[PDB]
Amino acid sequence: GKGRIFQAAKVYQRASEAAATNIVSGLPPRNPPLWLKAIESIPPAEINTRPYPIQHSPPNPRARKPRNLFRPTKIVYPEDELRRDFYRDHPWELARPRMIIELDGKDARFLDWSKGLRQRGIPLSGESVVQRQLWLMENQGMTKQEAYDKARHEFYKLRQLEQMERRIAVEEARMVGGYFGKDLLTVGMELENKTYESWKKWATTEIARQESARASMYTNVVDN
């Protein structure tokens, strides 16, 4: 028994009895702690009582002696199957960074998926395609594939314009005397040079080191 008897839930019951009477028989009990009356009407909650957890999926009806009746179940939605299909068809869509840090939690209040892929507050990513697909598939009664094609093609027409802006925006700026810094292609190559040079130092050092091992195999200390 490595545990200890924690009586944190009975601090009131214990303190209420110790303050009811006085140790010195024949005198009135002294004033109780200042906290005894503050939580007089705020009892603790019931702890350590395993309930039947919420079932997020229909439990196996064929099981006659089911186990894990007090185990929280996995939360699975209809979108999980769509996210896996999309991101697998567009693996490099994961390279596009996406922030999962919420600002105030009120993001699903301005999302009306009957308008289109572009919504307020969230970026155009594989989720917008999934939420748009789920809407058409349910409301418009489209099949998984039909809704997928429609919502998928709207995603491309919006991404194409994004890549065209970067090219034209730069070309347009130089036509009026606008210069920029080092592009990502150049910066990436310079970093490889600094690393390749460090590898060259490691190669020449080990190569020379192996020569000693090859010469140390045979013995020539006599100097014939």
Binding site: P53, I54, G105
Partner: protein, 253 residues
């Protein structure tokens, strides 16, 4: 609609489900590392972790705020304890609002059960209804034994169990943030939430900090009307009786 240092400059009076979710107050620990005792606050399982119910976190948080408020309304000494690398600004800010004590380092074992030795030379002071000091208790502040918090608010109960045990051993109420892997029987009022997140702790501390502030306001506002919400503690009460006894001798003699 979100600034990192917003829970300190202006914490909210009450936390909604949107605030708690945005602050990652529902991210439990890995399913493998769980305490089945606190399977009552878990909503499900996702990303390999347990998801704490956003409704259970709000109902327990609103209850603790009512506890921190009343204890401050009755002139109680509160203690906000958060001992983690970045939990110092949070605890100190909460204490300022609630006019309480802070603790952001390792709790020295025995500061409650062995307070006579540890808190020996620390100075005290006697204040009246309106928190203004009283003169004449010089001889009482030399024999009086050190104080103990009337309510502890731990932001990481899993780390410091020596503090929570001294509270249960000394009959002191406690409030803690019970993560999925924390034993819920260590405190009196649990707050199921993610204690590993620095953004969820600042929100809880702000709510509890504002609760104390709102409690101290009522207490002091009632004192101006000649309505004291508390009576002299037993320790100071005994000193009064001895004072009259010594004063009686002067009257006769």
């Amino acid at each position: 609609r979100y600034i990192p240092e917003q829970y300190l400059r202006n914490p909210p009076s009450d936390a909604s489900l949107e605030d708690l979710m945005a602050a990652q107050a529902h991210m439990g620990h890995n399913t493998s590392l769980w305490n089945p005792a606190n399977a009552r606050y878990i909503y499900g399982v996702r990303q390999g972790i347990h998801i704490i119910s956003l409704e259970t976190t709000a109902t327990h948080l609103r209850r603790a705020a009512r506890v921190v408020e009343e204890v401050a309304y009755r002139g109680g000494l509160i203690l906000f304890v958060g001992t983690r690398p970045g939990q110092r600004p949070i605890v100190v800010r909460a204490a300022e609002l609630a006019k309480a004590c802070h603790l952001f380092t390792k709790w020295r074992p025995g500061t409650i059960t062995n307070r006579e030795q540890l808190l020996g030379g620390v100075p005290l002071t006697v204040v009246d209804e309106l928190d203004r000091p009283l003169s004449g208790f010089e001889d009482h502040l030399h024999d009086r034994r050190p104080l103990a918090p009337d309510l502890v608010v731990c932001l990481n109960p899993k780390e410091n169990m020596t503090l929570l045990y001294e509270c249960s051993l000394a009959k002191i109420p406690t409030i803690g943030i019970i993560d999925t892997n924390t034993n819920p029987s260590w405190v009196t009022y649990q707050i199921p939430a993610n204690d590993d997140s620095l953004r969820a702790t600042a929100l809880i501390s702000g709510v509890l900090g504002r609760a104390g502030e709102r409690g101290q306001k009522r207490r002091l506002e009632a004192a101006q009307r000649g309505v004291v919400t508390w009576k002299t503690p037993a320790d100071v009460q005994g000193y009064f009786e001895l004072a009259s006894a010594r004063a009686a001798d002067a009257r006769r003699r």
